[PDB]
Curated annotation (Swiss-Prot):
Places the protein is found: Cytoplasm
Binding annotation for Mg(2+): 49, 53
Keywords attached to this entry: Cytoplasm, Hydrolase, Magnesium, Metal-binding
Protein family according to the UniProt entry: Belongs to the Nudix hydrolase family.
CDD domains with a match to the protein in the record: NUDIX_MTH2_Nudt15
Protein name: Geranyl diphosphate phosphohydrolase
Single GO BP term: dGTP catabolic process
Broad EC category: hydrolase
Tissue specificity as recorded in UniProt: Expressed in petals. Little or no expression in stamens, sepals or young leaves.
Residue span(s) of domain Nudix hydrolase: 2-127
Motif annotated as Nudix box, chain positions: 34-55
Function: Involved in a cytosolic pathway for the biosynthesis of free monoterpene alcohols that contribute to fragrance. Lacks terpene synthase activity, but has a diphosphohydrolase activity with geranyl diphosphate and farnesyl diphosphate as substrates. No activity with 8-oxo-dGTP and dGTP and unable to dephosphorylate geranyl phosphate to geraniol.
Length: 129
């Protein structure tokens, strides 16, 4: 088995967080995520992932936590971020991997969540300052 590093992004706007419907974890709601590429910082990865998935330009990317996820095994580094221009909205650029993006309140997250995300929600994870 291989151990892989993913970066998972909590993109916040006000009291809302961006979630998408995955198309591993089919038809569950998840945060933007993807594989750290060699040479990247966590922050570069976060930005790249959001740009590839939604065309959104993010900033003020800050480390929150890290979790271990056995399935392969994923070490998932959770970052928070804001939009560089909060007037922008997500566009579903990769329909092969996602059915759509939306803004949700942490006190009313959609279900079902991708299980690695549910795991941290169960543990009291909250990305909002
Ligand atoms: C909070 C989360 C999601 C923790 C788990 C991290 C994880 C398995 C990401 C998968 O990356 P991906 O979106 O590129 O899918 P895949 O591994 O199938 O390529």
């Amino acid at each position: 088995g291989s151990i892989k590093v993913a970066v998972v992004v909590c993109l916040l706007r006000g009291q809302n967080v961006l979630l998408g419907r995955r198309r591993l974890g089919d038809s569950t709601f998840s945060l933007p995520s993807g594989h750290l590429e060699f040479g990247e910082s966590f922050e570069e990865c976060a930005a790249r992932e959001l740009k590839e998935e939604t065309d959104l330009d993010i900033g003020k990317i800050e480390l929150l936590t890290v979790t271990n996820n056995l399935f392969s095994q994923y070490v998932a580094v959770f970052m928070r971020a804001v939009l560089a221009d909060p007037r922008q909205e997500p566009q579903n650029i990769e329909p092969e991997f996602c059915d759509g993006w939306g803004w949700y309140e942490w006190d009313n997250l959609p279900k079902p969540l991708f299980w690695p995300l549910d795991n941290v929600v169960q543990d009291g994870f909250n990305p909002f300052p």
